[PDB]
């Protein structure tokens, strides 16, 4: 199995990725859902890399750190490593072969990054203040 895996987490807005990381939590659609949990299971780690829709960042990266579950349907534990913002110029030269090498910012919700793909990405968090 593949030792680590990468995925694109889209939210609709701010409020609701800073109470993610503030209270290490999140949750996606069902489509999503046992997509998720095979990938927490087989893999020593699940990157999950976070995006509000119409915000031109990427608003950090976690680690996936449980299985999915009104009332707080389909929460899991998520562990935050970076939470700065990074500007989508900064990842312009990242396409993903697993989405028609379309740039990473462009993406549903869940789309799995290519794992060399998905590391050049992380990285670029090092570049930042």
Known sequence: HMPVRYFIMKSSNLR?????????????TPSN???????????????????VQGSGHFQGFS?????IG???????KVEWI??????????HHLLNPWNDNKKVQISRDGQ??????????????????
């Open 70 to 76: 009104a009332g707080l349907g389909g929460v899991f």
């Open 112 to 129: 799995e990054l290519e794992p060399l793909v998905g590391e050049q990405l992380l990285q670029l968090w090092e570049r930042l203040p």
């Open 33 to 51: 859902e046992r997509k998720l949990n095979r990938a927490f299971w087989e893999s020593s780690i699940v990157y999950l890399v976070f995006s």
């Open 63 to 67: 680690r996936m750190s449980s299985e």
């Open 16 to 28: 609701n990725l800073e109470i993610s990381q503030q209270k290490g939590i999140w949750s996606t």
């Open 82 to 91: 970076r939470k700065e913002s990074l500007p989508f110029q900064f990842a």
